[PDB]
Amino acid sequence: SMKVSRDGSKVTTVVATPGQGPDRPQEVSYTDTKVIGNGSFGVVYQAKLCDSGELVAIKKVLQDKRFKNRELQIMRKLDHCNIVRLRYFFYSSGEKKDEVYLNLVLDYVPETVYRVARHYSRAKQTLPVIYVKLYMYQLFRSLAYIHSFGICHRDIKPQNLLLDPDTAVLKLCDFGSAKQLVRGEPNVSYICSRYYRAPELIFGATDYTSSIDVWSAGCVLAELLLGQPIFPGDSGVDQLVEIIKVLGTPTREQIREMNPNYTEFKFPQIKAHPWTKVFRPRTPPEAIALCSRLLEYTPTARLTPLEACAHSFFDELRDPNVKLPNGRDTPALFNFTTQELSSNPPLATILIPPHARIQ
Amino acid sequence: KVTTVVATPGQGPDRPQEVSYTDTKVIGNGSFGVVYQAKLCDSGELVAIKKVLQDKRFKNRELQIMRKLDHCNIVRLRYFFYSSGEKKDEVYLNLVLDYVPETVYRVARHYSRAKQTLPVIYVKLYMYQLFRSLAYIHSFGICHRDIKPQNLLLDPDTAVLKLCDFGSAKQLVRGEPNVSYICSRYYRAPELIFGATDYTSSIDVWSAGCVLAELLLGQPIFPGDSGVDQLVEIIKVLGTPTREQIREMNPNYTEFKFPQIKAHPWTKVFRPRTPPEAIALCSRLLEYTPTARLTPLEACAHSFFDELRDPNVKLPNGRDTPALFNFTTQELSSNPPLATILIPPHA
Numbered sequence: 001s002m003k004v005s006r007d008g009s010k011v012t013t014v015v016a017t018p019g020q021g022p023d024r025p026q027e028v029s030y031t032d033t034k035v036i037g038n039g040s041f042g043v044v045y046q047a048k049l050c051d052s053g054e055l056v057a058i059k060k061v062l063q064d065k066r067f068k069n070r071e072l073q074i075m076r077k078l079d080h081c082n083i084v085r086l087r088y089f090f091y092s093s094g095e096k097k098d099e100v101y102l103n104l105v106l107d108y109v110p111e112t113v114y115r116v117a118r119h120y121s122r123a124k125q126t127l128p129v130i131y132v133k134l135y136m137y138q139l140f141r142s143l144a145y146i147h148s149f150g151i152c153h154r155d156i157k158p159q160n161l162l163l164d165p166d167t168a169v170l171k172l173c174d175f176g177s178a179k180q181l182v183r184g185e186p187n188v189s190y191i192c193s194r195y196y197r198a199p200e201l202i203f204g205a206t207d208y209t210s211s212i213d214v215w216s217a218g219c220v221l222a223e224l225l226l227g228q229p230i231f232p233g234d235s236g237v238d239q240l241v242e243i244i245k246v247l248g249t250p251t252r253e254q255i256r257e258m259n260p261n262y263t264e265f266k267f268p269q270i271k272a273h274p275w276t277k278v279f280r281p282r283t284p285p286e287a288i289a290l291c292s293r294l295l296e297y298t299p300t301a302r303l304t305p306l307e308a309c310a311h312s313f314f315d316e317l318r319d320p321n322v323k324l325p326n327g328r329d330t331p332a333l334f335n336f337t338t339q340e341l342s343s344n345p346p347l348a349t350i351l352i353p354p355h356a357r358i359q
Numbered sequence: 360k361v362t363t364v365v366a367t368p369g370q371g372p373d374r375p376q377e378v379s380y381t382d383t384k385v386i387g388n389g390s391f392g393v394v395y396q397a398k399l400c401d402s403g404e405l406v407a408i409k410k411v412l413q414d415k416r417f418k419n420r421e422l423q424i425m426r427k428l429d430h431c432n433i434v435r436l437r438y439f440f441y442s443s444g445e446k447k448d449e450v451y452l453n454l455v456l457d458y459v460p461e462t463v464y465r466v467a468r469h470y471s472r473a474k475q476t477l478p479v480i481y482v483k484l485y486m487y488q489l490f491r492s493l494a495y496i497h498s499f500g501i502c503h504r505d506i507k508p509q510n511l512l513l514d515p516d517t518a519v520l521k522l523c524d525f526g527s528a529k530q531l532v533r534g535e536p537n538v539s540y541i542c543s544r545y546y547r548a549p550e551l552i553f554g555a556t557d558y559t560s561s562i563d564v565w566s567a568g569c570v571l572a573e574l575l576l577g578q579p580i581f582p583g584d585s586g587v588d589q590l591v592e593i594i595k596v597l598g599t600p601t602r603e604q605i606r607e608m609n610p611n612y613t614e615f616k617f618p619q620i621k622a623h624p625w626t627k628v629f630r631p632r633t634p635p636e637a638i639a640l641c642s643r644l645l646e647y648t649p650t651a652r653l654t655p656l657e658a659c660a661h662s663f664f665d666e667l668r669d670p671n672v673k674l675p676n677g678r679d680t681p682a683l684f685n686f687t688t689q690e691l692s693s694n695p696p697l698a699t700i701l702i703p704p705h706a
């Protein structure tokens with residue numbers, strides 16, 4: 001249950017469970033709620049914590065009475081600077097009478113990559129490369145982190161990437177499609193959003209890996225560089241054609257690696273187009289090389305997130321003299337944990353620059 | 360200015376002839392090609408030229424399908440010819456089709472933008488003609504696979520509708536598997552979303568029901584930027600699919616983890632004034648079980664279209680309705696007795 005009180009301002013008081021740590025119920029009071037988003041079976045609100053005046057987001061979704069909520073279970077295990085934090089969670093009633101709702105109290109972040117990319121795009125401009133590096137690097141860290149638990153996000157897209165304009169901090173949100181992928185277990189091929197979907201998903205594979213998230217992250221990188229989506233299309237076929245026009249027709253081996261539910265091998269035989277000509281003239285060559293290593297047909301051939309973080313496109317971020325354009329310091333970038341580095345510990349060699357190993 | 364080609368007639372004999380056209384301009388594009396408008400020098404008649412890259416390994420399937428089609432609600436293939444194009448040294452197939460001035464997409468959008476709904480008379484005329492074109496193609500075992508407002512051409516003055524874009528079309532044979540990645544966002548049958556490769560022509564009927572619902576609503580009935588979001592929008596109307604319904608749809612794989620939602624009464628999906636027959640028709644098109652959906656010919660015989668069979672019906676423009684009852688044996692083959700309803704006594 002929750003209690004409402006009232007300058008006449010409406011206040012909601014709930015007893016909530018901490019997102020992380022021991023189950024020690026807390027009384028949480030908030031006010032000034034407003035809708036900031038919607039999604040399947042729910043709504044996202046912004047609210048202000050009564051005592052601190054701190055803004056939070058409350059994601060309220062319909063609760064299935066047969067099982068515990070998978071998004072909640074996944075979020076209870078996460079603790080990373082580039083993932084939106086689950087502060088508390090509580091149950092309540094909602095619109096549909098007699099139904100139970102799960103409420104996730106998360107950090108509130110002011111912007112999304114989607115809105116930012118769109119402001120620039122509409123003005124016929126592009127996000128300065130420094131921000132592309134900062135944002136993409138942080139996305140790859142959040143992915144190395146989740147993948148280290150075997151968790152695949154499954155729906156990486158600009159709308160699910162939150163950002164703090166002033167600190168240049170990026171946070172991954174929306175774990176509603178996230179799932180642990182276990183080798184030999186099949187998974188649904190209908191996840192992931194239009195323009196971001198890995199070709200093996202388009203082809204109907206159920207044996208895909210976490211590398212689907214890397215393909216998605218490459219699509220976001222390419223889009224931030226181009227000012228528009230690299231592989232648009234309103235159908236799977238049209239998407240594959242846009243892909244084929246860049247990468248060239250996949251080989252029969254590449255199809256086998258992607259492992260479609262079914263295919264006819266009836267796409268025309270198109271030769272790859274040089275990645276360099278995909279982008280505008282002065283695009284940094286390292287940005288281009290990075291995309292070419294993310295956006296590959298063979299899922300196993302794609303860089304892993306931790307390898308992406310170690311890519312040379314991000315070398316500028318490891319420069320001891322780097323600052324945000326606004327003179328501020330960059331957010332924390334090298335405080336890697338053992339968990340975070342577990343896929344390939346020796347990469348710490350590149351990842352943690354000499355100046356960050358200073359005593 | 361003037362382009363002269365030796366082109367092969369779309370139908371009949373393979374006897375090419377010289378064809379001259381002028382005034383070309385881009386009207387659209389798509390996977391591996393562009394659509395031009397042009398004017399035939401001899402008749403002054405406007406045509407559309409769909410030019411696509413040509414794979415030499417095979418015959419062009421869109422061309423082969425179009426060469427066999429002859430229906431008043433299908434865009435006509437006048438000629439076809441080969442030429443060069445943008446990509447140096449590549450060959451291009453050029454389809455010379457009838458030009459039609461509008462699309463259901465643009466018209467529906469004009470209405471939407473102006474906060475108005477398309478008069479029901481047009482919804483009936485357009486949908487009925489779409490179902491005739493589908494009854495026709497399905498009678499040859501051909502499934503269009505990409506029914507959507509942008510592929511539905513319209514002549515504003517005659518209220519004639521023509522199906523176009525046969526680039527995904529294919530003959531579907533029982534026991535042969537087919538790709539699940541065809542069909543466009545918002546129109547896709549749930550079995551396609553679920554990754555079935557054993558789907559039938561009824562995927563076109565689901566798509567047609569989505570168009571009908573959209574013309575009634577003023578916006579798409581099942582939006583979403585991912586398959587999962589689309590299925591949620593579907594589930595919010597039809598209710599959670601039953602284990603048996605899943606089996607009929609036959610997904611490549613599914614978890615059975617969607618919440619258990621009860622159906623929403625179709626009547627409350629639409630505005631209050633919506634004709635009950637329009638609603639009943641949707642309910643019979645938009646069904647989880649693919650075999651349960653009306654066939655196109657049964658859809659044409661539905662009572663929502665009774666007004667079109669009225670001997671006194673007229674277009675709002677004062678003109679007569681276009682041809683609606685010139686059914687063939689081929690066209691009626693799925694269920695001949697329906698001719699009884701379909702061909703009104705006055706026709």
Ligand SMILES: Cc1cnc(Nc2ccccc2)nc1-c1c[nH]c(C(=O)N[C@H](CO)c2ccccc2)c1
Binds near residue numbers: 057111
């Ligand atoms: C958690 C969170 C924090 N801050 C913001 N900020 C923001 C949003 C819009 C504009 C500017 C700032 N957003 C979120 C948030 C955004 N999306 C989601 C989310 O989980 N969305 C999914 C849809 O992707 C969803 C929402 C409701 C129901 C089901 C899924 C959380």
Ligand SMILES: Cc1cnc(Nc2ccccc2)nc1-c1c[nH]c(C(=O)N[C@H](CO)c2ccccc2)c1
Binds near residue numbers: 407
């Ligand atoms: C055949 C045709 C005739 N007339 C018109 N008129 C029209 C077009 C746009 C606005 C208003 C009127 N359009 C067409 C036509 C429309 N789409 C297609 C078509 O086949 N398009 C597909 C994409 O759906 C396509 C085009 C080029 C390459 C590959 C596919 C033909």
